[PDB]
């Protein structure tokens, strides 16, 4: 029959090629040779009619060979579509979206997608098994540091598969005034103003960072809402020095009313503090007890800076009533500890490292033709590149972290190791996490609200696509590839995460959907909610000290002098700004807005379109409620929630 074959080439600087490409149309009933059909032009679609006097039937693949003359010259193929003109059948979609290197022959299956069980005739069996074999050879596990969840093999960017590298245009675009004031005073809090300020919220932070309300507000809607939780009982670490009966009563009252909250940084205990230029840096594992007030404010009640040691008197408990500098100092310690835990655990580990696990596991276990692969890939874009770059300058030995963070120098890795034990399945699912932390219902928490709504929207999207390939729980149980995928993640990538609540197999449609939703959310909502706020809360050093120069107080006689001596110096404060500012000044793909089409059918596309509709409505509604908000919570607005962990 007569077909309109169309080939799409990438837009990146090197997507084009000077080599001719041969095409073959292979259907269920025979195939044909089209020969050298074109010479790939960057950012161009090449269409041409061809008449084959043979009956192919339904097309299964499109074979291609890039014949090179003297030099090989790579080519980035987006896709190939062949439309049978005249016959009333659908346009055959052959998704590629990858680099074609070498004179080797490749086959692109039609984008309908299917599971081994969903392909009884085994038409794509040979292909998927060999694609996976090649996948496993290209995407291997590794370990940047012992004791952490696994990452992608190698240590340099060049060790990543060609398809994982930034497209040239993004690579080039992605890649002191303070030193003038190098002879400027450093005696008072106001001196911190020499930094520079960059946004509406940041300025607010600079203007009211000493506010107990703003302080406690951050536990809910700030850059790190992953720590706070409703107190079921008083923390066992919260032991009282003599004479603290009054406070203890106020605590009991709030507990009984169920408005007592806690933010415990015990994770930081026993972690090696940095030594920058032979000077000792300091860390603290504080505990903050707060009360949710009827007017909607979360206010700090007490701050304990040290964990009580068994066999010795309890450490002091700081109160809002203590001298200004004493209380202010205790808060700075909490702000500093949050910065460390935020960056290492909430951001790096829970966001970047988790995503990488899902990425590698996916590339190793799910074939391009697989439904789940098509659902997930968009959300894995550029994760390996960014993470590799992080381990080659940010968290690497002698890197940026080691240069300015109090956890840098070794402790950061200990924290990352110790933190693995807390990577529980439930903590990655808002409905579950928010419930366990008693945040469900707390109307002051825009994070919890937006997190829940966004989760539901993604859940429906996942269900909608999964529903078209798994009509029964039995269908998911029998999916060997899906099962191996689940294991590659849980048992391998996460190193026995089954003990932390992760599934070792998916036994139902509802369970598989939940798992895919968990992955998709982690790579988008989870990361965005934690990444986006950095520029707003971490640019004003006092609100997030990268390091501390004096150990935590054990008495209540701190002076402004004590506060300044503890807080980062000019150089450090400046270095903090640079790192945060540059790493946040954001090109990008909004959640659900990926252009590449992996599915062929009209239904898969309808589900995606609904997903987009809902996200748009959520975005608009958030924008609105935010206009009537004191401090707008924007970290979960789909318009800015990224489609993958790519920054
Ligand atoms: C690949 C990003 C890894 C993020 C987690 C490790 C870190 C860090 C860091 C510390 C202090 C200031 C800024 C950064 C990173 C900022 C950013 O990624 O936007
Ligand atoms: Fe990030």
UniProtKB/Swiss-Prot annotation:
Compartment(s): Cytoplasm, Cytosol; Cell membrane; Lipid droplet
Function: Non-heme iron-containing dioxygenase that catalyzes the stereo-specific peroxidation of free and esterified polyunsaturated fatty acids generating a spectrum of bioactive lipid mediators. It inserts peroxyl groups at C12 or C15 of arachidonate ((5Z,8Z,11Z,14Z)-eicosatetraenoate) producing both 12-hydroperoxyeicosatetraenoate/12-HPETE and 15-hydroperoxyeicosatetraenoate/15-HPETE. It may then act on 12-HPETE to produce hepoxilins, which may show pro-inflammatory properties. Can also peroxidize linoleate ((9Z,12Z)-octadecadienoate) to 13-hydroperoxyoctadecadienoate.
EC number: 1.13.11.31, 1.13.11.33, 1.13.11.-, 1.13.11.12
First-listed, main subcellular location of the protein, grouped into a coarse class: cytoplasm
Similarity remark: Belongs to the lipoxygenase family.
Domain annotation Lipoxygenase: ranges: 115-647
Key words, A-Z: Calcium, Cell membrane, Cytoplasm, Dioxygenase, Fatty acid metabolism, Iron, Lipid droplet, Lipid metabolism, Lipid-binding, Membrane, Metal-binding, Oxidoreductase
Domain of life from the UniProt record: Eukaryota
Domain comment quoted from the record: The PLAT domain can bind calcium ions; this promotes association with membranes.
SUPFAM superfamilies, A to Z: Lipase/lipooxygenase domain (PLAT/LH2 domain) (SSF49723), Lipoxigenase (SSF48484)
Protein name per UniProt: Polyunsaturated fatty acid lipoxygenase ALOX15
Membrane topology: Peripheral membrane protein
Amino-acid positions noted as binding Fe cation in the UniProt annotation, renumbered to this chain: 347, 352, 527, 531, 647
Cofactor note (record): Binds 1 Fe cation per subunit.
GO MF annotations in UniProt: arachidonate 12(S)-lipoxygenase activity; arachidonate 15-lipoxygenase activity; iron ion binding; linoleate 13S-lipoxygenase activity; phosphatidylinositol-4,5-bisphosphate binding
Source organism per UniProt: Oryctolagus cuniculus (Rabbit)
Cofactor(s) the protein needs: Fe cation
Entry's Gene Ontology BP terms: apoptotic cell clearance; arachidonate metabolic process; bone mineralization; cellular response to calcium ion; cellular response to interleukin-13; fatty acid oxidation; hepoxilin biosynthetic process; linoleic acid metabolic process
Subunit architecture: Interacts with PEBP1; in response to IL13/interleukin-13, prevents the interaction of PEBP1 with RAF1 to activate the ERK signaling cascade.
A GO-annotated cellular component: lipid droplet
Gene encoding the protein: ALOX15
Pathway assignment: Lipid metabolism; hydroperoxy eicosatetraenoic acid biosynthesis
Catalytic activity line of the entry: (5Z,8Z,11Z,14Z)-eicosatetraenoate + O2 = (12S)-hydroperoxy-(5Z,8Z,10E,14Z)-eicosatetraenoate; (5Z,8Z,11Z,14Z)-eicosatetraenoate + O2 = (15S)-hydroperoxy-(5Z,8Z,11Z,13E)-eicosatetraenoate; (9Z,12Z)-octadecadienoate + O2 = (13S)-hydroperoxy-(9Z,11E)-octadecadienoate; (5Z,8Z,11Z,14Z)-eicosatetraenoate + 2 O2 = (14R,15S)-dihydroperoxy-(5Z,8Z,10E,12E)-eicosatetraenoate
Expression across tissues: Detected in reticulocytes (at protein level).
Location of the PLAT domain: 1-114
One protein family per Pfam: Lipoxygenase
